[PDB]
């Protein structure tokens, strides 16, 4: 057997994982046979928490559950209707665990847009028809917090399109206080934001197509404005009018267009708000304190921490999340070194002169994320080990002495495991390790004093037994030296790769700002089929613009998208040719989204290196894409700023060079993110230039092209295109 296309599509080979939910410092929940069990890590015993019969009172309509912090109630989510990437609506009913009954009084309404328990206890806040509502007790009536909500105009406690996708990476815009006195929330106003409109054809029985419309700021368009409010939840009554307190954003940021980009409660009387100018080389973290007597939140200038960049933008995508100490006096966050390397800096509540902080890590490698912060130690993930930017390991550092820097995951299994993710318990007493590659993913439980593996949660032995008759590809993670700098690649090689042979090459590209497509993770995907069955080498290259390797590399494409990142992808191909095992007459490239852009730019470059390629839902020019993402890298499309490079970096300008290649263009018609327009303009420019190419639209599909049948169809279509191109 080879790993066929049918195997990839039908999903015959399941890469298992293990998702648990740490409820306490020693206990986590897990799904058995649709049953939810509680596992205590101090012991080795399990306890039934929620039987599958309870979910079956709603049939198969259940989509998720959410247990209250105090474990007295369970939110049961059903009738899930997807919206954008993170947003959806659902129905909810609360289940009393103690009494084993549903609360049928003052129930959560239909089409709820977001809902969450408080941090402690069991208070609820939810959004419905763009307004926020609060329940102190599951059986109690809701307190209407806001009355300005309006479909696609005013959002209370939920993000609008661009804030969901590009800033928060979630639909939620509300944040409960630690002990639940205060609920904070953002409010967005889309008035003036121009609308993207497209057709949705729906099922065959719909006689007239309906026009979908979304407020969606394209590059240099009017953006949504924002406000931030904090309501007192313990003082809510039907007899008194509910009045939220407004926090004004830092003066240095409200001089023009700006964003809210991070919120974190420090204490019950303290909250950190990060803001960001529309020109995204300037951010401000304001620590704001509650005044007991005058009912206002104060944001003193002394508690404003500035971030900036002279070479690019702030943070990888957004300015980094602060992690505060339990007293709320100091906080840690990831920030660029003097050498451009992203590392954990330590700050105080007050800013020091010239905004200085203490770096507790350093070197030619980056901290990826901060996972836990206890009294004594800091847990983080980095790519330090073996100087591999696409490796991930758990580290443990002491706040007193920065030299005491353990690696907890480096050695465990160095052949099978170079790419770890972690899930630490409520106060870091235990932790789940998630080995994601390059071997078969491995999930294990650990105690934190001694790094003692308690048990194996998932070893993927079932997948092991099923792969034993299949010709397995291998993954090669390595680098090449260009101008004294090393750039990593990865190659999914055909089974028993014979370097003496010449193989066809497929560049699989994304190559967006801060992207990493060369890593030590394990994937059972389309590329494996191409190697296993078609004997095609699938390669990815992290050139300039790629992340996790310092700001010198990442900011190289500042104001210049469609430049060095596309050129570097061509050069990688040339380097693969010099390695002697690539058939130069059969080199191709494909990508999705930014990958689609880079693919099209590569093919239109006239390099002569690539026979063919496939662009899936490509960006075609940056004026068509949303403000927040685009302007972060390209600035505004004006004569005063970067309009010349906006006009110069389009796929359409390169139409004539596509005569040298075979091109497949694919786009979902209901793509809310990278709009069909973008491919519509590419095809119109190609047609105008007399260039042949091949095309495929997917009716009603969005950016994921993720409906099962469409998903199978696109990969079949693309597969056939490579067969034609290579055979």
């Amino acid at each position: 057997r080879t790993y066929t296309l049918a195997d990839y599509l039908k999903n015959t080979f399941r890469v298992k994982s293990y998702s648990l939910r740490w409820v306490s410092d020693s206990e986590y929940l897990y799904k058995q046979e649709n049953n939810i069990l509680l596992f205590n890590a101090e012991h080795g015993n399990s306890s039934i928490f929620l039987e599958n019969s309870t979910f079956e009172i709603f049939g198969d309509s259940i989509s998720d559950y959410s247990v209250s912090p105090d474990r007295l109630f369970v939110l049961l989510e059903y009738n899930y209707v997807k919206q954008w990437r993170h947003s959806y609506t659902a129905s909810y009913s609360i289940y009393d665990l103690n009494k084993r009954q549903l609360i049928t009084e003052e129930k959560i309404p239909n089409n709820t847009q977001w809902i969450t328990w408080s941090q402690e206890g069991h208070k609820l806040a939810y959004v419905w028809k763009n307004d926020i509502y609060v329940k102190i007790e599951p059986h109690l009536p809701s307190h209407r917090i806001t009355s300005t909500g309006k479909e696609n105009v005013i959002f209370n406690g939920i993000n609008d399109w661009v804030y969901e996708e590009e800033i928060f990476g979630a639909y939620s815009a509300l944040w409960w206080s630690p002990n639940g006195t205060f609920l904070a929330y953002a409010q967005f106003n889309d008035t003036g934001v121009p609308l993207i409109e497209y057709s949705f054809y729906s099922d065959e029985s719909l006689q007239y197509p309906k026009t979908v419309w979304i407020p969606y700021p394209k590059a240099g368009a009017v953006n949504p404005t924002v406000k931030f409010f904090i309501v007192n939840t313990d003082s809510l009554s039907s007899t008194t009018t509910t009045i939220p307190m407004q926090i004004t954003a830092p003066a240095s940021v409200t001089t023009g267009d700006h964003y809210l980009c991070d919120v974190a409660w420090v204490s019950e009387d303290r909250i950190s708000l990060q803001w960001l100018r529309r020109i995204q080389n300037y951010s401000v973290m304001a620590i704001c304190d509650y005044d007991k007597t005058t009912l206002v939140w104060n944001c003193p200038t002394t508690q404003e921490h500035i971030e900036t960049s002279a070479t690019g933008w702030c943070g990888r995508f957004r300015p980094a999340e602060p992690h505060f100490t339990s007293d709320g006096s100091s906080f840690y966050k990831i920030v660029s070194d003097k050498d451009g390397y992203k590392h954990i800096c330590q700050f105080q509540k007050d800013r020091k002169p010239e905004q200085v902080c203490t770096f507790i890590t350093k070197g030619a490698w980056e901290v990826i994320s901060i996972e836990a912060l206890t009294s004594d130690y800091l847990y983080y993930i980095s790519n330090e080990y073996k100087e591999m930017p696409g490796g991930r390991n758990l580290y443990k550092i002491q706040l007193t002495d920065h030299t005491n820097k353990k690696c907890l995951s480096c050695d465990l299994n160095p052949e099978r495991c170079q790419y770890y993710s972690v899930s630490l318990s409520k106060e870091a007493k235990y932790y789940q390790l998630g080995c994601r590659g390059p071997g078969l993913p491995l999930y294990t439980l650990h105690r934190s004093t001694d790094q003692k593996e308690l048990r194996v949660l998932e070893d993927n032995s079932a997948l092991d037994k099923m792969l034993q008759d299949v010709q397995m590809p291998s993954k090669k993670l390595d680098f090449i030296v260009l101008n004294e700098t090393r750039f990593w690649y990865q190659m999914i090689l055909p089974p028993h790769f014979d370097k003496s042979k010449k193989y066809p090459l497929l560049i699989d590209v994304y190559a967006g700002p801060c992207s990493q497509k060369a890593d030590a993770a394990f994937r059972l995907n389309w590329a494996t089929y191409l190697a296993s069955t078609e004997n095609i080498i699938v390669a990815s290259f992290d050139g300039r613009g790629s992340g996790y390797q310092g700001d010198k590399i990442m900011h190289a494409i500042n104001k210049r998208l469609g430049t060095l990142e596309v050129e570097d992808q061509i050069e990688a191909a040339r380097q693969f040719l010099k390695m002697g095992f690539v058939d130069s007459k059969r080199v191709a490239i494909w990508g999705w989204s930014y990958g689609g852009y880079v693919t099209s730019m590569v093919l239109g470059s006239g390099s002569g290196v690539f026979k063919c390629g496939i662009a899936v839902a490509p960006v075609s020019r940056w004026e068509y894409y949303d403000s927040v993402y685009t302007e972060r890298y390209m600035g505004l499309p004006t004569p005063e700023d970067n309009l010349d490079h906006y006009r110069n970096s389009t796929v359409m300008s390169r139409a004539e060079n596509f005569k040298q290649v075979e091109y497949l263009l694919i786009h979902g018609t209901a793509d809310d993110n990278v709009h069909f327009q973008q491919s519509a303009q590419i095809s119109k420019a190609l047609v105008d230039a007399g260039v042949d190419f091949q095309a495929m639209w997917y009716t009603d599909e969005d950016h994921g092209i993720a409906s099962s049948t469409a998903h199978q169809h696109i990969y079949s279509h693309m597969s056939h295109f490579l067969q034609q191109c290579f055979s």
């Epitope: 009172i57 059903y78 084993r100």
Partner: antibody
Framework: EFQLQQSGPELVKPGASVKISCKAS????????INWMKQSNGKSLEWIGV????????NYNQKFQGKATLTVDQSSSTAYIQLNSLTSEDSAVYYC??????????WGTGTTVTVSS | QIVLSQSPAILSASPGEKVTMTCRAS?????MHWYQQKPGSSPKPWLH???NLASGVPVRFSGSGSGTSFSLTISRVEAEDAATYFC?????????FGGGTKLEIDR
Amino acid sequence: EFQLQQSGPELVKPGASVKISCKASGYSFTDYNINWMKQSNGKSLEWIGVVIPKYGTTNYNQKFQGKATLTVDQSSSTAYIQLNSLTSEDSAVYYCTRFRDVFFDVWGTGTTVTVSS
Amino acid sequence: QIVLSQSPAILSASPGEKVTMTCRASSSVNNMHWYQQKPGSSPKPWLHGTSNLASGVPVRFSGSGSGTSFSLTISRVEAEDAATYFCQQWSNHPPTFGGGTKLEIDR
């Protein structure tokens, strides 16, 4: 190995109420959910609600929130449906059905209930 | 409450023939179920999980479909098949029934 027998037919005046039984035997009664349906003569079927025998947890169709009241005896392996404050439009057949974590895999004889003066 | 529609009301096909059946929803559904009921008798479980055959169910039957149009196919129709088939949905609460496909036999 899966028997669902319900009590016999029923006549009642408008305003009154009635309880109908559903005896279960052969299997471990405490493991699967009892769901109740309604079928007016000629019309389509309608779901009323469900109970989990083990803990007595119920879930009603909003349409019958006030109308039906479901209960369970686990020593007798019997489930009941109390239909309260009846009228002419409550006249129909009523089925107790099992749920095997997927669908209704056992159906009882069906109790014809008539409401008239 | 997703409203299901049974296509058609009464399907009259002879013994040994092709007989296909289809349930049509107002909104998408992940799995479809099917139940056989004869006049003066209770419904019976036939096909669960779109297409799987219940315990003791004949093998001349098969199911299929996805989204807003599922289906069920009876192969060589026998005399005993004469009944009424109902489609059940419960991927969306509350569960619903499609108002009957009456299997008539043409002889």
